[PDB]
Symmetry: C3
Subunit: 382 residues, 3 copies
């Protein structure tokens, strides 16, 4: 007969047994403080609420640096091309009757920015509530709720600035801001594209294609190339106003993740705060079920839009069944979650996730509780 | 003087005459159940609420299968090319002083997945409410409300995973999941692009372009082609981690539509449930207006991002005017809606819609009531 | 000790001291009216609320007209090409032993539509509230709240139809509707792309690239070109159902901005209206701080996805500190905002914005109050 469920984050209330409601639209980039002494219609309760500015957390794959460069054309006339040491090149031989060779190569290379592929975007605010001698702080994700015996704080919002798959480019001492690219080259990079010339890891260029053709023109042959000769950096700069900038504040780069506070004050979210002074709220997720967790296996990749899957062994006691969520987390960041009705005893639960880095150990978690160890996922782009 | 309007789905309440509020953030992929006996401060009322998991419904155009293949180059030397039977080919003749022909053709073709263009995305939850001997179930769209005399259930949420225009690729026995492509080729498909080699309907390939050039190189000429030789499937697989996967559960494919439950447990929506035990809510859309409906004509297409327009003849009685919505629906799925202030008597109302398939008969509907017949739209991509 | 903050738009209420709540999901394209006489459990208060249809305001850059055309190939044999007057052309000379010239040129040019790049998208509803002899109307942005002593109206919603960076194409007497393009050419335009042939300002074509190659074939040489010969307009029309249409009503074009009401009746937003008859709401943004404003400088561009930055000199009196927002606005439209904790006396505040046109004078604003003059930003695409 029981059907315990902790996936509901919120409260049941009797509107006549509630004492205070705060309901408002708040600038995303602003904090908010509320302080009041709650008195009886000779004992007072101190209420102190602090809501911090909206933070964005983006799980990314670092793509390395984008480069500007010049495309050079050379003519030579077995026996190797004069330009052979160039990493990025294209050639055609005209031979017989040794050869007579046309070559293209990139040179005057210079890094212009660092690029990051968006894997996941999540917004949150840190919320702290003191009610009497109770003090509790929690990072509340947008579209989730802070729940306590006497106070509920729900945040509801939407933002459409960034999308999964976008590429963020930072031109310099990041902070300040960057550009969003919606069409950074991936499966085909041709010279001229945004993202054309990349160095994924300081060494090794991923060279673009040169889709055009050579031609040979009473003396010496002269080579011509009839494709595009303008680098992607130059083409983008020539129409820079076509691209979308964003600004940042208090940036924090870590491996495969960027967090910051977006200072765009045009954005708002909705905050609702409900307080009951006497009779406790009915916590909708209250239950007597107890969960033990450990990892079993993992497959897939960090830093990947495809992602990974963490297999968890989950033990349920004190309930016949329990509808809940099992998460894949490491160091207080969660990368995926699976809603599941557990049955009493052992359960096997697969959790699909995305994000993290080579050093991540993805743990099986329930609420704030996690397994003793996590598992590493595989590298992407092998 | 009257200005009846049923476009407001919700209630007016006196907060002191309300008995229970449930307010919470719920895991999108989780159900929720609430059961309580409502008692007087010796007669009890059974309250039973069942909210089902979020479902996504996507109106799509089935694009057929994407293929891998190999690009082959041949040299021949009136009188037809040795490779002439290949559906996808490209040739250049070098003649005079019969010809001497260079050819490219695709072969070793193999279907790798089924592709679907997103036309419309809608999320919903089925909500069932028992209050006493009243029992009512309704599919509630995200950002709409369930309304009854004693209970309101509103769902508010946002999801940004899928966008109109995205292409979904399913690699195998769909269920499990798929990939999202944001740049599947449409107006120009070149060999190497995602979507390059398609078969829209099991027969007939839509062949990609081959943008490169041929060249002819003491004996026989040998042809060369200087464009890309790697298929789009291979190029995408080589950088697969650049693309975004999604997972699915309890899939249901129908013609030009896919429905499933997304098991991503990181997503949440907001649920508000308000209950009045005694005095009925004021239903904000209550009215005495009566509507009769029939179709008049249709133009445009199913399976199209451009869409169709259904013209409806709508009769209004019992009101001088009525602000309401007229919808284009078939088999309990609605594909478009027009808000309109009807005037007493006959009205002509045009409803713009998107989606459906060749067998769809788009009917004129108001609320749960529809015309006796619907009209077929035209096919896309003719 | 004080920490005044006006970034919270909303109210604190005691639920037992509130008299009426309206909560509902409203068709985006519908208005809503509520009229009631508020009576004591012999004096009545007239309540009259009018909510107007959702309006979209899009800051854009007008891209000029897109053209259809025909690609013509000519052979000629110092001394200028027969086709030299064509604005869009491509040539290769085959010379020595004067030249023998192959040329391509565009002709039969015809404008097919007007294109606009989306810079910013904002939705709003006009809300008017009469409570007794108080009457107040305000344009309320989605996810903001109307706040007065006796009535709060909050709008919460999300729409995903348009994105920053999309290109809107209007084919004719705009109104009716248009097409959305997610991949309009920017940094590289090749013949065949959406956006290939543009005229930014009635004179001057921005010509596309012709990435293919010429070749020369007992008499006269004949030129061939092996690249794409089909215009972008024709290629798009050939697969028009792949693109997304939208409809419009009561359009209003101004320089670099378009406003309209989207008649898509499938879209809804959420409206909450709370009324207290007797004791005034606690306005969460109430404060005694007083602000003076003037511009100091500006940099950056109108009509640009990169944007501008307006530097404001802001004087704070009557408070030691004040957390608020300073905006960049002109003629009752705001283009950016910065949340800031001002300190008593002078402050320098930088406000990042996007949008506007050459005639815009961006002013420093707080609430409904603005500086006496604004500053012009620079043109984009110079
Ligand atoms: C959720 O999806 C993952 C992802 O794997 C799928 O990705 C799709 C894009 C598509 O390519 C499909 O063919 C592919 O299976 C599933 O994980 C995969 O499962 C298969 C079969 O068990 C394994 O062979 C893969 O190694 C494995 N990959 C990863 C990264 O885990 C997963 O099964 C699916 N369901 C759940 C509950 O996570
Ligand atoms: C809503 O838009 C449709 C779509 O038709 C428009 O699509 C735009 C993308 C653009 O190309 C524009 O030129 C085009 O008209 C309108 O329907 C069309 O209306 C015209 C004129 O009556 C007819 O000739 C078309 O056949 C018709 N097409 C379809 C599919 O119905 C429609 O009028 C407009 N308004 C409403 C209220 O639906
Ligand atoms: C908010 O961002 C703007 C935009 O300028 C940045 O844009 C990024 C896309 C990237 O290219 C980065 O290199 C670039 O600085 C900042 O404005 C710029 O600031 C610099 C340094 O002071 C000036 O040299 C530029 O002229 C100026 N441009 C504009 C349009 O204002 C701005 O500083 C930043 N911060 C704030 C608070 O607005
Ligand atoms: K080439
Ligand atoms: K070609
Ligand atoms: K060329
Ligand atoms: Na070529």
């Amino acid at each position: 007969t029981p059907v315990w469920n902790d996936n509901a984050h919120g409260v049941g209330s009797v509107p006549m047994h509630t004492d205070l409601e705060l309901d408002f639209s708040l600038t995303s980039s602003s904090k908010y403080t509320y302080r009041r002494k709650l008195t009886n219609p000779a004992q007072s309760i101190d209420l102190h609420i602090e809501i911090e500015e909206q933070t964005i957390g983006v799980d990314v794959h670092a793509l390395g640096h984008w480069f500007d460069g010049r495309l050079n054309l050379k003519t030579s006339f077995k026996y190797e091309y004069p330009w052979h040491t160039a990493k990025c090149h294209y050639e055609r031989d005209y031979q017989y009757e040794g050869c007579t060779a046309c070559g293209l190569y990139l040179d005057q290379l210079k890094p212009v920015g660092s690029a990051y592929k968006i894997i996941t975007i999540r917004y949150s605010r840190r919320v702290c509530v003191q009610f009497g001698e109770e003090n509790l702080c929690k990072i509340i994700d947008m579209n989730d709720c802070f729940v306590s015996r006497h106070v509920k704080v729900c945040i509801i919002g939407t933002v459409s600035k960034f999308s999964q798959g976008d590429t963020l480019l930072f031109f310099g001492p990041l902070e300040g801001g960057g550009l969003i690219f919606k069409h950074w080259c991936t499966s085909t990079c041709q010279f001229g594209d945004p993202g054309d010339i990349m160095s994924p890891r300081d060494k090794g260029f991923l060279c673009p294609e040169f889709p055009g053709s050579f031609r040979k023109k009473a003396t010496t042959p002269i080579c011509e190339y009839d494709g595009n000769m303008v680098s992607g950096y130059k083409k983008v700069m020539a129409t820079i106003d076509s691209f979308q900038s964003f600004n940042t504040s208090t940036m924090h780069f870590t491996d495969e993740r960027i967090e910051w506070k977006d200072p765009d004050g045009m954005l708002r979210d909705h905050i609702n705060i409900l307080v009951t002074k006497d009779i406790d709220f009915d916590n909708l997720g209250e239950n007597p079920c107890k969960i033990g967790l450990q990892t079993s296996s993992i497959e897939g990749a960090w830093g990947s839009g495809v992602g990974f899957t963490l297999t968890c062994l989950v033990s349920l006691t004190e309930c016949p069944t329990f509808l809940t969520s099992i998460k894949a987390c490491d160091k207080a960041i969660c990368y995926g979650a699976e809603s599941v009705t557990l049955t009493r005893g052992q359960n096997t639960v697969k959790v699909s996730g995305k994000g993290g880095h080579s050093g991540s150990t993805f743990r099986c978690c329930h609420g704030e509780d996690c397994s003793q160890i996590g598992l590493h996922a595989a590298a992407p782009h092998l």
